Structures are given as C-alpha cells and as structure tokens.
Amino acid sequence: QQEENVPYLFKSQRFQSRFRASHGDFRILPKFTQRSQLLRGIEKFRVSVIELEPQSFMLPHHCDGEAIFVVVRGQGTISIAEQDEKNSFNLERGDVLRLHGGSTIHLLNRDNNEKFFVYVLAKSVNAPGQVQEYFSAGGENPESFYRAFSSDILESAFNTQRDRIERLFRQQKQGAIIKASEEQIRAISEHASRTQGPFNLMKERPQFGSRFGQFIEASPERFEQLRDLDAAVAFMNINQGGMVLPYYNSRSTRVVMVVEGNARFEMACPHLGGEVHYQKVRGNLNVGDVLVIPAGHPITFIATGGSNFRVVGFGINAMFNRKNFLAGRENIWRNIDREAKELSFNMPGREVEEIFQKQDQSYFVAGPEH
C-alpha cells in the first residue's frame, strides 16, 4: 500500500516475464522512470532475473543491451556465439560476466536438482532504457526473427528450397526455456571453462567487514571489463541480528536486489523532503525486491532475525565512487577536527568526540533488539 509510493522501491512482483516458459523464466523490471523522474539519471539501465529449472536449456538469442550477468544461485553453462569466435563458461555462484551487446547466447542448467538464478544489469544502445531480445532460435514459439523474412529471401540466403527452410522455422513450439537431456547437457557444456571469462571475488577478503557483515565489490578501477559501462558489482551480507551502519555512496547510484533474507531500510532523501528537509524513506525488503539508492543518500539496512540478509548491488557511475560511513570507529567524523565538531553541534567538542567514539566497531554491528 504505502510502499507503492516510495519511488526507489521496486517490489519483486513488478518484474514482468518476457515470455511463458516451462523450464524457467526471464523477467525484467520496468524502466526506472516508469513512475518517477527522480530516476532519470539511470534511465538507460534495466535489471532482470533469469531462472533456469534443473536440466533446462534457454534457446539462442541476443539482446540489444550491454549486460553484466551475476550468478546468485546454482550452476549453469553460458555459450556465446560471435561471428568469428565461440566461448563457453561453466558459471557458479558469485561469478560475474560482462556480455557484449549483440552476443548470441544460450544457457544450460545441467544440475538435477538446483535452480540456476542470474541477476542481470543491461544498458540500452537504442532508445533509452529499451532492451529487447532477439530469438534466432525458435520457430512458432518463441517466434524466431527469421520468420520476419520473406520466403524467397530465406530460400536465396540459405540456398535451400523455400518449403524446407520455412518448415525449419515452424518446428519449435515449446518456448524459450525447455528441457535438456543428460546427453545434450554433456555435449553442450563439453568445452566450457573480446569476450573474457567470469570473475569471482567470493574467496577474497572483504573491503569492509566485521563479525556482523561483509562488503566486497568488483570496481571498474580493478576490472577493465566493467569500465565501458562504468559499473560495479557489489556483494553485501549482513549477518542475522546485524545492521550495516549508516553510510552513503559518493557518486554511484546502486540498484540493490535481495538474494537472501529480509531487512528494514531507512534512507534520508531531500528530494521527497524552502530550506532542506530530509524525508524519512523507509520500508522492508524481501527476496527478489529491488531498492535504488541514489548517490549521496544516507542509508542503513537492518537484518530482520531468522536469516542473514544478502544482496547484490549494481553500481552505476561507479568509477571514483567511495563509501562514506556515518557512524562507527571508521567514519567521516574521524577526519573532522574537534573545533569543527563543536561548531557543528553547538556542544563541547570533547563531548561530541566522546559520543562518536562510543561505537568501537566499524561497518556492521548488532542491530536493535527490536
């Protein structure tokens, strides 16, 4: 109800399936400007989810957006067909893959039991925010784009009698994500290991961490394959009963999707808030929900109880972004002098400092008893 009026919150139900598939789904959030011009700064970007059931195959297609795939759950093989090169990669949880726009891909989940789930960021190259799929594979369902060509053109192009080529493009009726056999799975992923492979930071030391949570990020400073989009991929885990201390991002807007657990968030927004007033922008986040955190906006997340709270965040305008913590042992006030603190709060500087030093921990701490 009220949460339908928080323009930064995109509940999971707002993701729209692009097709009706038996063995998975592909669902995409509307353009970010659908309900608010406050998100015009990220209009070119879309987020989506791909889900493959066990023993499933997503048919060959390309998109007209530059993408970043992040594996959230399971294992799957991506096969990429370019004009002059083939690549296949066996992806696992935490893998990040930059996929060039126009790359023809297919996906395979070889596992017998576990779903394969990918969170995707795409950026348009045609009309702003418009990202479309082009099924080369297919027939009647999904419709293959080859059916847009006249039969004489297909005959001449394929050097194949028109009735035979037209028949080829009518056989598939099962949809875009279908069953795959054990032998097909073997064959397709047999060679899997411009288009570089995935990277994975799961085993690295976090950038920021404590006993209550972890943050690590793939930045374009480090990963050249993210530089063109100027994107980052952030992984944040808040342990059960924890919170991330209030912080803000200096320049990067974040598109945060919940992968595990639940949290309460509170954000300070001057836009929705004449002299400045900060609107209290609040809600709850569940698995599959998205929150957009505009740059500069103070935010906190508080894990709510029975689970860790885990998110993947895409960062837009990521180069040169820095996290600025607003409480904790390591925070911005560490770099503000005592006299400036005294003037800031109209109280003795040593007293301000005493209060600001009470929190001995950094980054993530125990949340409120609630």
- Asked if 91 is part of the footprint of Na ion (rule: CB under 5 A), the reply reads no
* Residue 291's binding partner out of Cu ion, Na ion, none, with CB under 5 to 8 Å set by partner kind: none
User: Which of 271, 280, 334, 350 is close enough to bind Cu ion by CB under 5 A?
Assistant: 271
* Residue 352's binding partner out of Na ion, Cu ion, none, with CB under 5 to 8 Å set by partner kind: none
Cα 183–80–252 angle (5° rounding)? 130
Q: Say whether 145 sits in a helix, a strand or coil.
A: helix
Q: Say whether 93 sits in a helix, a strand or coil.
A: coil
* Residue 21's binding partner out of Cu ion, Na ion, none, with CB under 5 to 8 Å set by partner kind: Na ion
Q: Cis omega (within 30 of 0) on the bond before 142?
A: yes
- Asked if 316 is part of the footprint of Cu ion (rule: CB under 5 A), the reply reads no
Residue whose CB is less far from Na ion, 120 or 269:
120
* Residue 271's binding partner out of Cu ion, Na ion, none, with CB under 5 to 8 Å set by partner kind: Cu ion
What does DSSP say about strands 263-269 and 299-303: parallel, antiparallel, or unpaired?
A: antiparallel
- Asked if 53 is part of the footprint of Na ion (rule: CB under 5 A), the reply reads no
Nearest approach, Cβ of residue 128 and Cu ion (Å): 21
- Residues 298, 187: Cα–Cα separation, whole Å: 50
What are the residues whose beta carbons fall under 8 Å from the beta carbon of 344, sequence distance 6 or more? 336, 352
* Residue 53's binding partner out of Na ion, Cu ion, none, with CB under 5 to 8 Å set by partner kind: none
- Asked if 282 is part of the footprint of Cu ion (rule: CB under 5 A), the reply reads no
What are the residues whose beta carbons fall under 8 Å from the beta carbon of 214, sequence distance 6 or more? 206, 208, 235, 236, 237, 364
Kindly calculate the radius of gyration of the chain based on its CA atoms and give it in whole angstroms.
24
- Asked if 269 is part of the footprint of Cu ion (rule: CB under 5 A), the reply reads yes
- Asked if 280 is part of the footprint of Cu ion (rule: CB under 5 A), the reply reads no
- Asked if 21 is part of the footprint of Na ion (rule: CB under 5 A), the reply reads yes
Residues in contact with Cu ion by CB under 5 A are 269, 271
Residues in contact with Na ion by CB under 5 A are 21, 25
